[PDB]
Design an enzyme around this catalytic site. Structure first.
Site, mmCIF file in Angstrom:
data_model
loop_
_atom_site.group_PDB
_atom_site.id
_atom_site.type_symbol
_atom_site.label_atom_id
_atom_site.label_comp_id
_atom_site.label_asym_id
_atom_site.label_seq_id
_atom_site.Cartn_x
_atom_site.Cartn_y
_atom_site.Cartn_z
ATOM 1 N N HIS A 189 77.371 88.753 26.315
ATOM 2 C CA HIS A 189 76.654 87.558 25.834
ATOM 3 C C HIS A 189 77.218 86.870 24.578
ATOM 4 O O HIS A 189 76.596 85.891 24.109
ATOM 5 C CB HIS A 189 75.171 87.910 25.587
ATOM 6 C CG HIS A 189 74.954 88.819 24.416
ATOM 7 N ND1 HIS A 189 74.617 88.368 23.144
ATOM 8 C CD2 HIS A 189 75.014 90.160 24.331
ATOM 9 C CE1 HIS A 189 74.489 89.408 22.339
ATOM 10 N NE2 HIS A 189 74.731 90.509 23.031
ATOM 11 N N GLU B 210 71.477 96.084 7.047
ATOM 12 C CA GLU B 210 72.759 96.027 7.784
ATOM 13 C C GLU B 210 73.708 95.049 7.064
ATOM 14 O O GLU B 210 74.155 94.034 7.603
ATOM 15 C CB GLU B 210 72.584 95.629 9.283
ATOM 16 C CG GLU B 210 73.770 96.120 10.136
ATOM 17 C CD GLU B 210 73.787 95.550 11.497
ATOM 18 O OE1 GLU B 210 73.435 96.358 12.394
ATOM 19 O OE2 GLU B 210 74.136 94.341 11.683
ATOM 20 N N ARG C 28 78.662 84.417 21.967
ATOM 21 C CA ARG C 28 78.694 82.961 22.049
ATOM 22 C C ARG C 28 80.114 82.461 22.311
ATOM 23 O O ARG C 28 80.325 81.583 23.159
ATOM 24 C CB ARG C 28 78.153 82.364 20.748
ATOM 25 C CG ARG C 28 77.915 80.882 20.808
ATOM 26 C CD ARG C 28 77.118 80.404 19.597
ATOM 27 N NE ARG C 28 75.830 81.135 19.518
ATOM 28 C CZ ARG C 28 74.630 80.594 19.686
ATOM 29 N NH1 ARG C 28 74.505 79.292 19.828
ATOM 30 N NH2 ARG C 28 73.536 81.375 19.631
ATOM 31 N N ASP D 2 72.793 89.630 11.289
ATOM 32 C CA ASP D 2 73.645 88.447 11.335
ATOM 33 C C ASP D 2 73.266 87.336 12.330
ATOM 34 O O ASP D 2 74.125 86.555 12.750
ATOM 35 C CB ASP D 2 75.079 88.938 11.500
ATOM 36 C CG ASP D 2 75.268 89.797 12.727
ATOM 37 O OD1 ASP D 2 74.537 89.522 13.713
ATOM 38 O OD2 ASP D 2 76.179 90.693 12.696
ATOM 39 N N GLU E 212 77.959 84.572 13.832
ATOM 40 C CA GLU E 212 77.438 85.808 13.179
ATOM 41 C C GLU E 212 78.214 86.199 11.934
ATOM 42 O O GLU E 212 77.640 86.625 10.947
ATOM 43 C CB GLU E 212 77.359 86.969 14.165
ATOM 44 C CG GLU E 212 76.330 86.780 15.276
ATOM 45 C CD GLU E 212 76.808 86.047 16.526
ATOM 46 O OE1 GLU E 212 77.895 85.404 16.519
ATOM 47 O OE2 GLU E 212 76.004 86.010 17.482
ATOM 48 N N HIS F 186 71.793 89.141 30.183
ATOM 49 C CA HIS F 186 71.115 88.414 29.072
ATOM 50 C C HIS F 186 70.432 87.145 29.613
ATOM 51 O O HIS F 186 70.908 86.566 30.598
ATOM 52 C CB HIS F 186 72.184 88.075 28.046
ATOM 53 C CG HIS F 186 71.670 87.488 26.770
ATOM 54 N ND1 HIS F 186 71.140 86.221 26.695
ATOM 55 C CD2 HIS F 186 71.682 87.972 25.505
ATOM 56 C CE1 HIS F 186 70.796 85.964 25.446
ATOM 57 N NE2 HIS F 186 71.114 87.011 24.703
HETATM 58 C C1 LIG Z 1 73.154 82.572 16.546
HETATM 59 C C2 LIG Z 1 72.435 83.859 16.923
HETATM 60 O O1 LIG Z 1 71.564 84.214 16.205
HETATM 61 N N1 LIG Z 1 72.768 84.544 18.056
HETATM 62 C C3 LIG Z 1 72.095 85.798 18.443
HETATM 63 C C4 LIG Z 1 71.384 85.558 19.782
HETATM 64 O O2 LIG Z 1 72.280 84.958 20.702
HETATM 65 P P1 LIG Z 1 71.748 84.289 22.092
HETATM 66 O O3 LIG Z 1 72.972 84.109 22.949
HETATM 67 O O4 LIG Z 1 70.502 84.988 22.653
HETATM 68 O O5 LIG Z 1 71.333 82.861 21.570
HETATM 69 P P2 LIG Z 1 69.853 82.236 21.332
HETATM 70 O O6 LIG Z 1 68.996 83.278 20.669
HETATM 71 O O7 LIG Z 1 69.838 80.809 20.860
HETATM 72 O O8 LIG Z 1 69.409 82.168 22.882
HETATM 73 C C5 LIG Z 1 69.897 81.171 23.784
HETATM 74 C C6 LIG Z 1 68.627 81.423 24.581
HETATM 75 O O9 LIG Z 1 68.820 82.145 25.796
HETATM 76 C C7 LIG Z 1 67.613 82.012 26.525
HETATM 77 N N2 LIG Z 1 66.731 83.133 26.153
HETATM 78 C C8 LIG Z 1 67.016 84.014 25.116
HETATM 79 C C9 LIG Z 1 66.133 85.025 24.801
HETATM 80 C C10 LIG Z 1 64.960 85.159 25.536
HETATM 81 O O10 LIG Z 1 64.140 86.050 25.231
HETATM 82 N N3 LIG Z 1 64.691 84.311 26.551
HETATM 83 C C11 LIG Z 1 65.533 83.298 26.873
HETATM 84 O O11 LIG Z 1 65.276 82.505 27.823
HETATM 85 C C12 LIG Z 1 66.998 80.657 26.090
HETATM 86 O O12 LIG Z 1 67.298 79.550 26.928
HETATM 87 C C13 LIG Z 1 67.500 80.428 24.646
HETATM 88 O O13 LIG Z 1 67.715 79.092 24.220
HETATM 89 O O14 LIG Z 1 70.839 86.774 20.297
HETATM 90 C C14 LIG Z 1 71.790 87.793 20.506
HETATM 91 C C15 LIG Z 1 70.979 89.009 20.942
HETATM 92 O O15 LIG Z 1 70.811 88.984 22.339
HETATM 93 C C16 LIG Z 1 72.590 88.135 19.249
HETATM 94 O O16 LIG Z 1 73.654 89.089 19.488
HETATM 95 C C17 LIG Z 1 73.131 86.893 18.550
HETATM 96 O O17 LIG Z 1 73.635 87.217 17.249
HETATM 97 O O1 LIG Z 2 69.310 95.227 28.655
HETATM 98 C C1 LIG Z 2 69.402 95.640 27.484
HETATM 99 C C2 LIG Z 2 70.575 95.461 26.703
HETATM 100 C C3 LIG Z 2 70.646 95.991 25.413
HETATM 101 N N1 LIG Z 2 69.566 96.623 24.844
HETATM 102 C C4 LIG Z 2 69.628 97.053 23.427
HETATM 103 O O2 LIG Z 2 69.660 95.850 22.666
HETATM 104 C C5 LIG Z 2 70.347 96.088 21.454
HETATM 105 C C6 LIG Z 2 71.487 95.108 21.251
HETATM 106 O O3 LIG Z 2 71.076 93.839 21.603
HETATM 107 P P1 LIG Z 2 72.182 92.740 22.054
HETATM 108 O O4 LIG Z 2 73.303 93.424 22.781
HETATM 109 O O5 LIG Z 2 71.415 91.779 22.846
HETATM 110 O O6 LIG Z 2 72.707 91.903 20.802
HETATM 111 P P2 LIG Z 2 73.790 92.312 19.700
HETATM 112 O O7 LIG Z 2 73.762 93.765 19.390
HETATM 113 O O8 LIG Z 2 75.136 91.952 20.222
HETATM 114 O O9 LIG Z 2 73.430 91.506 18.482
HETATM 115 C C7 LIG Z 2 70.848 97.503 21.485
HETATM 116 O O10 LIG Z 2 70.006 98.368 20.756
HETATM 117 C C8 LIG Z 2 70.817 97.871 22.957
HETATM 118 O O11 LIG Z 2 70.678 99.267 23.193
HETATM 119 C C9 LIG Z 2 68.404 96.794 25.572
HETATM 120 O O12 LIG Z 2 67.453 97.368 24.991
HETATM 121 N N2 LIG Z 2 68.324 96.296 26.880
#
Ligand SMILES: CC(=O)N[C@H]1[C@@H](OP(=O)(O)OP(=O)(O)OC[C@@H]2O[C@@H](n3ccc(=O)[nH]c3=O)[C@H](O)[C@@H]2O)O[C@H](CO)[C@@H](O)[C@@H]1O
Ligand SMILES: O=c1ccn([C@@H]2O[C@H](COP(=O)(O)OP(=O)(O)O)[C@@H](O)[C@H]2O)c(=O)[nH]1
Ligand SMILES: CC(=O)N[C@H]1[C@@H](OP(=O)(O)OP(=O)(O)OC[C@@H]2O[C@@H](n3ccc(=O)[nH]c3=O)[C@H](O)[C@@H]2O)O[C@H](CO)[C@@H](O)[C@@H]1O
Ligand SMILES: O=c1ccn([C@@H]2O[C@H](COP(=O)(O)OP(=O)(O)O)[C@@H](O)[C@H]2O)c(=O)[nH]1
Lengths: 375, 375
Positions: free
Chosen positions: B213, B126, B215, B104, B140, B246
């Site tokens: 984390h 999924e 949104r 998602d 999501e 995060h």
């Molecule tokens: C809309 C969407 O798809 N959201 C997903 C995203 O949200 P998440 O909150 O990570 O949103 P984004 O993937 O846009 O990341 C915002 C970001 O965080 C920072 N950033 C993120 C990753 C990274 O490796 N390095 C870094 O610096 C960056 O500034 C970037 O712009 O990832 C999460 C996993 O963690 C998921 O649960 C969410 O479903």
């Molecule tokens: O510091 C971390 C936090 C989470 N996870 C793993 O990351 C996955 C989930 O990712 P996240 O929580 O970022 O996003 P979401 O599940 O909410 O989409 C799971 O398998 C966790 O076990 C990880 O490997 N390191």
């Protein structure tokens, strides 16, 4: 008597193409009748340019915003990214309380997406049409499904389209059956006294009016259609075919290649909606793959052969007016030949009815929207 | 014995984020076990850069294509446009037979859209999770709905998610219940023999492991969460909290402001999935708004307070492992305080079960895909 501008719901109508513009024009006009309740904002993507302007000019609608996105021979990706980026900007500037989108164009989809990306409610005018085939029409079936899951209010033209949404688990209390706003437009354009050169050069021949532009029909299917149409003209000496050719360069290549310079076939520029509706109303037979023509024809009592393998206008089939012809040359020829040769076959298709409503859909839509917001 | 490369189905897996990568890695590994039947192509958007690479490195997966889209503090429009344009180019180059998308994320949605814009079938790993609230989780819930109308094959983790799709009028013959691939991953990461500094500095204290984390939780809701967590640490002297924060700068600001330099609270960099699973397995209590943690915790028997107003993991609630806590400071405090004070309340949540399956989901998914294509 004076208009108090200080307490209004901001309603943004969004569209980008000829068909959306024709179907949304009555709604815009209706929103404008409630100036103390509603601030009506019109935003166009101009996915279409010339064919959109043609409609805006007839209804006298000047958009508040115009993104002018159209590119020559543009891709679905071109429209998706240009439309989304521009609409996000418009929405951040104007901050409407609701966005109204129409039907099933790529504009419809990215307008809905942009609204969702700004947490703005979406009202879907012409909600719930289905063929259940994601490659016919392509990409319109997917656009109305995608839009379906994003919409907060669903303005279904017919009972069946409402049922389609109900079967997909949409909130029953958000689905309203209004009629199709096509009929709102049609009742103001058609008129007893009317002439056009097309109708001058007809003499007392029978007019076959044609249009063809479906994406999935491009290429081989249209070549099949056009070859059938030349054979009909060869056989029926008292027929003239008029084809207001869509601006898509691809359609124009095929049209010119197969039908260009053929006697009693007239390839012309797109007609404005007053000319088109009036010429249609005076036609013996229509051959089309247009959506809107399928909703208008029953009210005119004019038989239509639908040049597709599917339709999402089953009510016009049930009315007798519409017959699905497919895209095979021999089958199209056969069906059209029977209607031009057998008067009883034609008679079955020419009883006028109003399966798409009474032309008051727009009033119902505005009401629903106001009531939703307690306004 | 030798591998005949000449008659293979091209299967493109697409993802861009840590959670997708963890859940897709087992699937990529299983696709690779069929080298004469399948050409496995791995494409990443790199919606995430560092957190994605952390996962790929553990599983040893080198993408065939890497769009490297991530921008600092990127918008949903950033992801959507950069992702669509890049994936369209990859699909036109590679011409896969089927695209597999996960879950998602925004990547999931624009991966499905790009496939559709190339008339390539989509398999949704999924499939069918719902809260029925388009603003929780945002975006999501909408992403999985959008992806749902696009998908040709639906790989549902659970009976309920299958039922959800069935109730939306999806083709029953295209919906398959497989278990969640999160379990496939978990069974290979967790080990009986393990240490980490975070665990060493614990002594014999109870470990509360947290992540946050979502949104829609950014700002006020996270501030409530974090204030509750400080109070718990104040009251419970034998607790240490570990928070792998995060990479979102917005999360980090809130984390540092409220929880930075607080005794017995440890803000650390994201843990790789081996470290995270093993530290989770050895935790007394988790506080999270993560989706994946909700699927993993029941199998570990570790109580979780879910810091949201909704969840789409009802099976973990039914297992007793998950409890919805909301985002109110007093309520989170109260519920967490009871679990850290009352052993019988904790006992009710700590029975391990496998409501998300047996960790053989990937096998089932590849089987379904081959059978679909008669391969
Ligand atoms: C809309 C969407 O798809 N959201 C997903 C995203 O949200 P998440 O909150 O990570 O949103 P984004 O993937 O846009 O990341 C915002 C970001 O965080 C920072 N950033 C993120 C990753 C990274 O490796 N390095 C870094 O610096 C960056 O500034 C970037 O712009 O990832 C999460 C996993 O963690 C998921 O649960 C969410 O479903
Ligand atoms: O510091 C971390 C936090 C989470 N996870 C793993 O990351 C996955 C989930 O990712 P996240 O929580 O970022 O996003 P979401 O599940 O909410 O989409 C799971 O398998 C966790 O076990 C990880 O490997 N390191
Ligand atoms: C996916 C999508 O939304 N398609 C819609 C679009 O298809 P249509 O086939 O018009 O597709 P586009 O709107 O992309 O237009 C293709 C185009 O044709 C040419 N062009 C078009 C209009 C114009 O006013 N001038 C011009 O030159 C341009 O080269 C342009 O790139 O409009 C039709 C109405 O006619 C609708 O039935 C379709 O649902
Ligand atoms: O030359 C033309 C051809 C069609 N139309 C009208 O345009 C609308 C349909 O648009 P189109 O066929 O382009 O798209 P579709 O309905 O298939 O989306 C209908 O209301 C027609 O009456 C028009 O005004 N002039």
């Amino acid at each position: 008597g004076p208009v108090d501008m200080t307490e209004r719901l901001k309603v943004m109508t969004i569209f980008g193409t000829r068909p959306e513009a024709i179907k949304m024009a009555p709604l815009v006009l209706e929103l404008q009748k409630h100036p103390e309740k509603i601030e009506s904002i019109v935003t166009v993507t101009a996915q279409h340019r010339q064919m959109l302007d043609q409609v805006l000019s007839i209804f006298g609608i000047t958009p508040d915003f115009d993104l002018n996105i159209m590119k020559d021979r543009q891709t679905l990706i071109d429209i998706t990214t240009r439309g989304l980026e521009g609409l996000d900007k418009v929405m951040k500037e104007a901050k409407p309380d609701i966005v109204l989108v129409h039907g099933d164009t790529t504009t419809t989809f990215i307008a809905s997406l942009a609204a969702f990306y700004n947490q703005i409610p979406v009202g879907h005018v012409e909600a719930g049409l289905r063929t259940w085939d994601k490659y016919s029409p392509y990409p319109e079936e997917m656009n109305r499904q995608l839009t379906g899951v994003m919409a907060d209010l669903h303005f279904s033209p017919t009972a069946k389209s409402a049922t389609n949404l109900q079967k997909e688990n949409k909130d029953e209390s958000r689905i309203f059956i209004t009629g199709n706003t096509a009929i709102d437009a049609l009742k103001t354009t058609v008129k007893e006294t009317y002439s056009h050169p097309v109708l001058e050069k007809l003499g007392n021949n029978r007019l076959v009016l044609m249009t063809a532009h479906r994406r999935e029909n491009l290429g081989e299917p249209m070549r099949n259609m056009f070859r059938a149409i030349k054979r009909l003209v060869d056989k029926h000496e008292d027929v003239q075919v008029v084809y207001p050719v869509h601006m898509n360069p691809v359609v124009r290549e095929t049209a010119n290649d197969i039908l260009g310079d053929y006697g009693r076939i007239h390839l012309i520029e797109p007609l404005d909606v007053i000319d088109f509706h009036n010429v249609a109303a005076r036609s013996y037979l229509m051959l089309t793959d247009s959506g809107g023509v399928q909703e208008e024809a029953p009210s005119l009592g004019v038989p239509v052969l639908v040049l597709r393998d599917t339709t999402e206008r089953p009510e016009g089939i049930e009315a007798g007016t519409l017959k699905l012809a497919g895209t095979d040359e021999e089958t199209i020829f056969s069906l059209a030949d029977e209607l031009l040769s057998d008067k009883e076959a034609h008679d079955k298709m020419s009883k006028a009815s109003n399966p798409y409503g009474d032309g008051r859909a727009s009033e119902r839509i505005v009401e629903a929207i106001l009531k939703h917001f307690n306004k």
